[PDB]
Amino acid sequence: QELGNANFENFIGATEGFSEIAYQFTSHILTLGYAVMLAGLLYFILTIKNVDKKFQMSNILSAVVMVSAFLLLYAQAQNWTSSFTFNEEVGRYFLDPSGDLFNNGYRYLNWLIDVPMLLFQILFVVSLTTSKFSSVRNQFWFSGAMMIITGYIGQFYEVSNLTAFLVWGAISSAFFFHILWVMKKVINEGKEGISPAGQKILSNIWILFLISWTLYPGAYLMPYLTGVDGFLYSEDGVMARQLVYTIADVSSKVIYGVLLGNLAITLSKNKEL
Amino acid sequence: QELGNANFENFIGATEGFSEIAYQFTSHILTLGYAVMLAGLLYFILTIKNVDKKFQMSNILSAVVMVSAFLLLYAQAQNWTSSFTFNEEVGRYFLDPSGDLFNNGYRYLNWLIDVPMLLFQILFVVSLTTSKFSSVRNQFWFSGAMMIITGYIGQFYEVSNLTAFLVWGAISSAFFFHILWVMKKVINEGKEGISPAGQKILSNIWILFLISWTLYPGAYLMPYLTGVDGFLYSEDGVMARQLVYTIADVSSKVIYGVLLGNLAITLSKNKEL
Amino acid sequence: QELGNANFENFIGATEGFSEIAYQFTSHILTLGYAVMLAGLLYFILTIKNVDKKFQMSNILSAVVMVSAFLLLYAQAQNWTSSFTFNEEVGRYFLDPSGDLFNNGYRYLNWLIDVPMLLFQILFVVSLTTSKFSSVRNQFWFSGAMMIITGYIGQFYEVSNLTAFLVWGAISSAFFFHILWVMKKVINEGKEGISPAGQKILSNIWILFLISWTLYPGAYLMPYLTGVDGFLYSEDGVMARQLVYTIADVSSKVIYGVLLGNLAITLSKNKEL
Amino acid sequence: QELGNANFENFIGATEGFSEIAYQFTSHILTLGYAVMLAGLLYFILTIKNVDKKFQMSNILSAVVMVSAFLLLYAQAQNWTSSFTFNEEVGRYFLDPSGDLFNNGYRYLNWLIDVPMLLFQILFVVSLTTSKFSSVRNQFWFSGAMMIITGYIGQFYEVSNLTAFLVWGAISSAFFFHILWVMKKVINEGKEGISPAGQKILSNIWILFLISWTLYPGAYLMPYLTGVDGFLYSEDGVMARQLVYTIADVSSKVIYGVLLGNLAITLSKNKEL
Amino acid sequence: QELGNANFENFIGATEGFSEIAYQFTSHILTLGYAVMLAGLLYFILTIKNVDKKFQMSNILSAVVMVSAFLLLYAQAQNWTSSFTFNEEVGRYFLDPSGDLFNNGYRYLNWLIDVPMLLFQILFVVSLTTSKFSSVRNQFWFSGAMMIITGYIGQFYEVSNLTAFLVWGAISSAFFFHILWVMKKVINEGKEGISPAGQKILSNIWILFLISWTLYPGAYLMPYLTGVDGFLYSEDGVMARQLVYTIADVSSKVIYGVLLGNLAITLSKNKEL
Ligand SMILES: CCCCCCCC/C=C\CCCCCCCC(=O)OC[C@H](O)CO
Ligand SMILES: *C/C=C(C)/C=C/C=C(C)/C=C/C1=C(C)CCCC1(C)C
Ligand SMILES: *C/C=C(C)/C=C/C=C(C)/C=C/C1=C(C)CCCC1(C)C
Ligand SMILES: *C/C=C(C)/C=C/C=C(C)/C=C/C1=C(C)CCCC1(C)C
Ligand SMILES: *C/C=C(C)/C=C/C=C(C)/C=C/C1=C(C)CCCC1(C)C
Ligand SMILES: *C/C=C(C)/C=C/C=C(C)/C=C/C1=C(C)CCCC1(C)C
Ligand SMILES: CCCCCCCCCCCCCCCCCCCC
Ligand SMILES: CCCCCCCCO[C@@H]1O[C@H](CO)[C@@H](O)[C@H](O)[C@H]1O
Ligand SMILES: CCCCCCCCO[C@@H]1O[C@H](CO)[C@@H](O)[C@H](O)[C@H]1O
Ligand SMILES: CCCCCCCCO[C@@H]1O[C@H](CO)[C@@H](O)[C@H](O)[C@H]1O
Ligand SMILES: CCCCCCCCO[C@@H]1O[C@H](CO)[C@@H](O)[C@H](O)[C@H]1O
Ligand SMILES: CCCCCCCCO[C@@H]1O[C@H](CO)[C@@H](O)[C@H](O)[C@H]1O
Ligand code: NA
Ligand code: NA
Ligand code: NA
Ligand code: NA
Ligand code: NA
């Protein structure tokens, strides 16, 4: 069957199909995904006034990100269930092309909201020392955009052209490393002149940021992480990818947002944790 | 017809089918489910300022849980009606696999929000005495997650492998008992140093918590509670399961949330009740 | 064909079909239904601060009821259009079972929100004299639930078993009379020690309550109110039922809520109308 | 084909079909419709505190009307696209009865919200002199309802029975004239003893009211305004009808609401325009 | 296949079909579109109180525009996926007419909100010097409407009648140039008597306005910008058009709104940036 430049889910779906567990789990984890985001939207709105005025833009940007992530994860949940249909005879879910091919690209372009806003929002909580606000913001946003767009092109080829997949991935990675570099700088300057309590939180934020963001290129590579005809080039790999996205999404957006809120409280003149 | 690792609803649906009453009731009770949750969302938002600032996080977390539960119960309501279709010739609803198999697993993974947040939220109303806040929270969250994940694996096998069903269920149960243990401690420490009115409420909360949470493993076992080829391995058991979920959901989320709100009022310096 | 324990709409739909007017009107009146409820939701939220704090729970409970009623009436609007499909050859809408049978039972189980909350909410406006708050509430809620549950069982049989229909209906009626009894008591005690203006409103509330609530058993019986093979056992009776529900819904929920709000204003120490 | 008592859209749709332009425009204009209403909902909520408390009920009722109109226009937009399907062979959209016949009656019954509330809401801005508040309200509401109900019956016959169409239309018209009469009285009494600024606005409101409300019987007659086999008994007439509704809807609801808000500001003791 | 007065997307879709990348990208970019708008809605509401009262109408009108754009872009996202269906045999998406033809006309009529409101809203932030507020508003609104309506007629013919396409486009362009003229005047008068910081922002607003608004006629012409049978009369041109719309939409609505908000802050007597 002729699929072209399509994600590997569609190939598994079209040949082997998915077991009840594989299909249902993938559905469940996406559903949990979008549920978490809408719950988070409510949380961040409802807690705006828990911090001093100057910090409240962080709450607002969290909320912005929640909207994006909800809409996407919801749309993608539906895309999953439309793309694969139960076959009675064998008792597995197979590619139903009338529902469109499944594509992870939805996530990527929506990152053009999430990434810039997540990177931006810390700059409303921490004070920089030697770095300039506008400079950091511009570096974040440029490298963010390039990271995403290059990756986005990559993933179309994850089956059809493994070379293009890896080369685009590599280029993307370069921009990723730049972001890591700049964020580390920000975190360090953030720590300067604040309580030990706030410094502990920023330490935690950095570890959360580093792990959670790294999951995303993890999900990129997922089908191939056990090499050719490996364990992960299978319904098991499909499950793994969406699990990793969901963990990454919750970590990088919600928990990140919560920790920033907690930092904002410690830095607030009225309030205490 | 090969169904595999699927819930028992699909087996009843595929062999006997469901009567008008069985199909419609199941539909109605899920609808009532999600209606209750959205109504609850409104209630908890609209009553935030009925309690002192420090208590208001309980209202917010109630609201968070309402969002999760609404989304899930709504999604599951639709799943029910898509999965079973009327057959004119016999006048019963039968498995329609084009709608996907029905699976209760949606609930389980969404509990990864509900359970942690419900356990968490009491710690914003009551003061601990001998226990440490972070300790209780960590025990709740770890045991919560393990309870859910093990159960989630179990339920896939409730027909296909009765042994796996029961063993996973048993392991889950161990974690459940731990939670019960910790919550009892919390309730007792909560009672110390507060009005008799607030103590009465916490007494009620404990009974509500104990019954409502125990319904959930009840629903797990439901098809087998009258043994093999029992009364409950039938459309009657299908109805019963979703009824029990809905009672449990309303009790454990809404009423629980309401009682905590009432406790918060009694502990509030301004307010009376 | 074999329909079983199904509402009479499905029997009309399956034999005679519905005319354009009958089908469209039923659709229109349900649509108006849910529109009214969402508009009411807005009204009750937006007018919360028009009354003293102590009265504001009445506004909140109105809002709660609006959410329930919206969701249900919306869902039921869609159920109507899915259940009956145009036949080109004869030019009438006939039962389309692929859409599920139509069932009024959706309403009934959602009353488990509406009824308790509507009865409850007056107790936040009026002061009782000789009666106890918790006593009245418990009687309302118990008799409410029994009324609904017994009726709910009844209506499944409105075609399939006329005896069961009437017996369950009769039992339901007993609990209805109890509620009427208790509400009358409440209204009388409410009138004691308040302005003539507030007393006039409570007089109006009682008449509204009595008529509007009585429409509901009216809708129950509707197909049979002109006896066997009567005028109303027809598409005309189908129309009539849903019209009566919608009148009853608007009266018993919205207008009731509005009048209570007006009462709350007169009893409010700052406020004037 | 046998269509029965159906709107003329369905007859054009069933015989000639609709061109790309006719089908798409009708779709676009309904979409614009419901978009305007939801935008208006936001506007009216967000501007509540721009006027003195006593005037704020006008904002609230505007908002109520917006909800109704949104829901309806949205529902009707979907009805349009479901009712007419592209035929490849000829390249026109034809009646698809599996989607139900299109009916304008949805609008009419929703007017049972819109009309009463629009007429009501002015009575919260202007002061009457010689007329009684409750008297005007009752006349508005009675004549409103009769206007709508009679018209609603009429439009079912606009093809099937031209006599009934015109007679019901005529009766409706009588009630319309009564409303015009009463509104003129209200406007004049409104003008008495208020600033020149407020008087100018009421002058504008009257012209807006008169034109916008008259469009609605215009849309009623639309197919026949060029007589038999005229220009307008065609896809061109279908387009025209929905355009006129949309102009009327925006004028009679949104702009009307805006002008009243502006009047409320001029009459407000705190505020300036 | 007879398509008639239809957009060129449908012709590409009906002959060549779309590759995975072309179909998916178009879907992704529209999704990002509507996501951005809903996020923007939240932002503009949540930041109303960040500026002095007099400026807050700009926030409200931003919000209004967000609602319109969300609804449209959402609706259009769905229209895309309904209009083109995967063909298994060749592995390309082809026109599926059961989903309706795709038409960009949805956008145009919704501009009847967006354009007037965007032009209007600046007049609440800047002070005019030479010009009259009502005069500028009327010129904006008249020329806006004429621009849109003429363009709207044009685009129906972009394939079927290239002459009509270009003539209507030309007429539209005339009105566009008028708007540019008036806006330039506004921006210059805005700069007079305000801080250098606010002047820099208005400089930026002008460049943003000029580029972003010019993209829209760009998208109009897109298929023909490489002449006959050029690179862009292809799936590549389809992609390009929707990319350009989305860039234009984000720029002209969100970023424009953000910059105005920033200007409002600098002009605010309480607040600083
Ligand atoms: C190919 C394009 C890729 C698209 C993705 C690129 C990232 C852009 C993200 C958001 C822009 C939102 C617009 C906000 C513009 C104003 C920012 C600003 O004013 O700066 C903050 C201010 O200094 C503090 O007060
Ligand atoms: C909320 C969403 C977030 C934080 C997304 C982050 C995405 C990345 C860090 C993506 C990184 C990638 C690489 C570094 C290589 C492969 C391509 C990407 C874009 C997945
Ligand atoms: C709002 C949802 C709640 C409170 C869910 C609670 C779920 C449980 C207490 C589940 C318990 C289970 C067992 C103890 C055994 C079987 C597996 C579970 C997960 C159903
Ligand atoms: C908002 C919904 C309300 C107020 C519903 C009220 C329902 C009733 C009063 C139902 C009464 C019934 C009887 C007394 C006999 C037949 C069975 C019932 C439940 C319809
Ligand atoms: C927001 C909706 C409004 C203001 C609707 C107004 C409707 C009318 C004024 C209808 C008038 C009619 C006639 C006077 C004759 C034909 C039947 C009607 C109902 C369309
Ligand atoms: C938010 C939407 C906006 C700002 C839309 C702006 C639209 C235009 C500036 C359209 C311009 C056109 C021309 C000048 C020629 C072709 C026809 C139009 C309407 C696309
Ligand atoms: C306290 C407020 C009092 C409101 C009284 C206003 C009454 C308006 C209700 C309208 C009822 C119209 C009844 C029409 C009957 C159907 C006849 C249609 C002709 C065939
Ligand atoms: C950095 C990690 C990248 C590892 C690249 C390994 C490439 C795997 O090789 C690929 O495996 C597929 C699935 O088994 C096969 O279907 C393909 O034919 C094969 O090219
Ligand atoms: C604590 C409750 C667990 C008891 C397990 C009950 C054993 C059920 O046994 C099962 O019953 C099914 C339905 O009757 C049969 O179809 C299966 O063959 C049988 O394995
Ligand atoms: C108290 C109100 C209840 C009145 C009961 C009336 C009995 C109706 O009798 C029923 O009428 C149906 C409709 O034609 C027939 O199809 C049934 O066979 C018949 O039993
Ligand atoms: C303006 C209000 C009165 C208008 C009445 C016009 C009479 C229309 O007459 C009708 O025209 C239809 C369309 O051409 C024909 O198909 C019908 O046969 C004819 O009865
Ligand atoms: C200002 C830019 C306008 C240039 C318009 C000239 C291009 C018109 O060229 C058109 O190309 C189409 C596909 O490429 C063909 O199908 C048409 O037959 C042809 O007229
Ligand atoms: Na599926
Ligand atoms: Na079904
Ligand atoms: Na239908
Ligand atoms: Na269509
Ligand atoms: Na598609």
Q: How many CA atoms lie within 13 A of B61 on its CB side?
A: 22
Q: How far is the CA of A226 from the centre of ligand 2 (A)?
A: 20
Domain covering C1-273: architecture: Up-down Bundle (1.20)
- Contact indicator for A154, A172 with CB cutoff of 8 Å: yes
Neighbours of B89 (CB within 10 A): 7
In whole angstroms, give the CA distance from residue D26 to residue D23: 5
Query: What's the one-letter identity of residue A60?
Result: I
- The set of residues, in sequence order, having a beta carbon less than 8 Å from that of E196 and lying 6+ positions away, is none
Q: What is the DSSP letter of D224?
A: G
Give residue for tokens 């996501």.
E35
**Dist CA E35 CA E32 (whole Å):** 5
Residue D132 CA to ligand 7 center (angstroms) comes to: 19
Which residues are CB-neighbours of B29 under 8 A, at least 6 positions away? B239, B242, B243, B246, C109
Q: Give me the helices (H) in chain D, please.
A: 8-15, 20-46, 56-83, 105-121, 133-155, 162-191, 196-221, 235-249, 256-266
Length of chain C: 273
* H runs (alpha helix) in chain B: 9-15, 20-46, 56-83, 105-121, 133-155, 162-191, 196-221, 235-249, 256-266
Whole-angstrom distance, CA of residue D245 vs CA of residue A159: 53
* CA pair distance A145, A161, nearest whole angstrom: 23
Rounded Cα gap, residues B203 and C223, in angstroms: 50
Distance from CA of B28 to the nearest CA of C (A): 5
- H or E, element range at C163: helix C162-191
Among all bound ligands, the one having the nearest atom to the CA of B173 is 3
Name which of C114, C182, C108, C91 is nearest C143 in CA terms: C182
Contact between A68 and E35 using a beta-carbon 8 Å cutoff: yes
- Kindly provide the b/e burial profile for residues B102-115, where b requires at least 16 CB atoms within 10 angstroms of the residue's own CB: bbbbbbbbbbbbbb
Number of CB atoms found within 10 A of residue E203's CB: 12
Whether the CB of E100 is below 8 Å from some CB of chain D: the reply is yes
Asked whether the beta carbons of C32 and C246 are under 8 A apart, the reply is yes
SS3 (DSSP) at B60? helix
> E247 touching A, CB under 8 A?
no
- From C109's Cα to the closest Cα of chain B, the distance in A is 6
Number of the ligand 7 atom closest to the C-alpha atom of C204: 1
Contact C258, C211 (CB under 8 A): no
Report which residue type is found at B110. Answer: N
Q: Which two tokens stand for residue D135?
A: 């008297």
Return d(Cα A264, Cα B3) in angstroms, integer. 52
Tell me the pairing of strands B84-87 and E84-87: unpaired
CB atoms within 10 A of CB A227: 9
Rounded-to-integer distance, Cα B263 and Cα B125, Å: 7
Angle at D90 between CA D86 and CA D95, to 5 degrees: 40
Residues C145-181 as b/e (b if ≥16 CB within 10 A, e otherwise) read ebbbbbbbbbbbbbbbeeeebbebbebbeebbebbbe
**Can you say how many angstroms the Cα of residue C136 is from the centroid of all Cα atoms in its chain?**
21
Q: Which tokens in the block code for residue B43?
A: 């209630």
Both tokens of residue D223?
């197919």
Contacts of B170 (CB under 8 A, 6+ apart): none
DSSP output for C46-59: HTGGGS-GGGHHHH
CB proximity list for B134: less than 8 A, separation 6 or greater: none
CA E105/CA B211 separation, integer angstroms = 58
Mutating to test ligand 1, I would choose from A56, A112, A115 the residue with most ligand atoms within 8 A of its C-beta, which is A112
Antiparallel, parallel or unpaired: β D92-95 and E92-95: unpaired
Amino acid code (one letter) for D173 = S
Q: What is the residue type of C227?
A: G
* Yes or no, beta carbons of E91 and A2 under 8 Å apart: yes
d(Cα A246, Cα A234) in Å, to the nearest integer?
19
Q: How many whole angstroms from C187 Cα to the centroid of ligand 14? A: 45
The CB density around residue B270, as the number of other CB atoms within 10 Å, is 8
Q: Which of these, B91, B74, B107, B111, lies nearest to B22 by C-alpha position?
A: B91
Tell me the C-alpha distance between C95 and D113, whole Å. 31
Rounded Cα gap, residues D207 and D194, in angstroms: 19
| Cβ of B167 below 6 Å from ligand 9 | no
Coil, strand or helix at C99: helix
Q: Answer whether E75 touches A (CB < 8 Å).
A: no
- 3-state SS of D49-67 is HHCCHHHHHHHHHHHHHHH
Give the DSSP letter string of chain A. ----S--THHHHHHHT-B-HHHHHHHHHHHHHHHHHHHHHHHHHHHTGGGS-GGGHHHHHHHHHHHHHHHHHHHHHHHHHHHHEEEETTTTEEEE-GGG----THHHHHHHHHHHHHHHHHGGGTSPPSSS-HHHHHHHHHHHHHHHHHHHHHHHTTTTT-HHHHHHHHHHHHHHHHHHHHHHHHHHHHHHTTS-HHHHHHHHHHHHHHHHHHHHHHHHHHGGGTT-TT-TTSSHHHHHHHHHHHHHHHIIIIIIHHHHHHHHHHHT-SS---
Tokens coding A23: 């299909």
Q: Which long-range contacts (CB under 8 A, 24 or more apart) does D131-134 make?
A: D131/D185, D131/D186, D131/D189
Q: Who among B6, B63, B71 is closest to A20 (CB)? A: B6
Tokens of A25: 């789990």
Q: Are E178 and E188 in contact (CB under 8 A)?
A: no
Q: Does A159 touch chain E (CB under 8 A)?
A: no
Cα gap D144→D116, rounded to integer Å:
6
Resolution of this structure in Å = 2.7
**Is some CB atom of chain E closer than 8 A to the CB atom of D200?**
no
Closest atom of ligand 12 relative to the E162 alpha carbon: 20
- Cα of A258 vs its chain's centroid, Å: 16
Residues whose CB is under 5 A from ligand 16 (ion)?
D 81, 85; E 100
Choice from D163, D167, D168, D224 to test ligand 11 binding pocket (greatest atom count within 8 A of CB): D224
Q: What DSSP line would sit under E54-92, residue for residue?
A: GGHHHHHHHHHHHHHHHHHHHHHHHHHHHHEEEETTTTE
Q: What are the Cα distances from residue E270, in Å, to A270, B255, E264, E266?
A: 21, 45, 11, 9
CB atoms within 10 A of CB D90: 11
Rg (chain B; Cα; Å):
20
E142 residue type, one letter: F
Assigned token pair, D127: 């002061």
Q: Which two tokens stand for residue E256?
A: 């424009």
Domain ranges within chain E, ordered by starting residue: 1-273
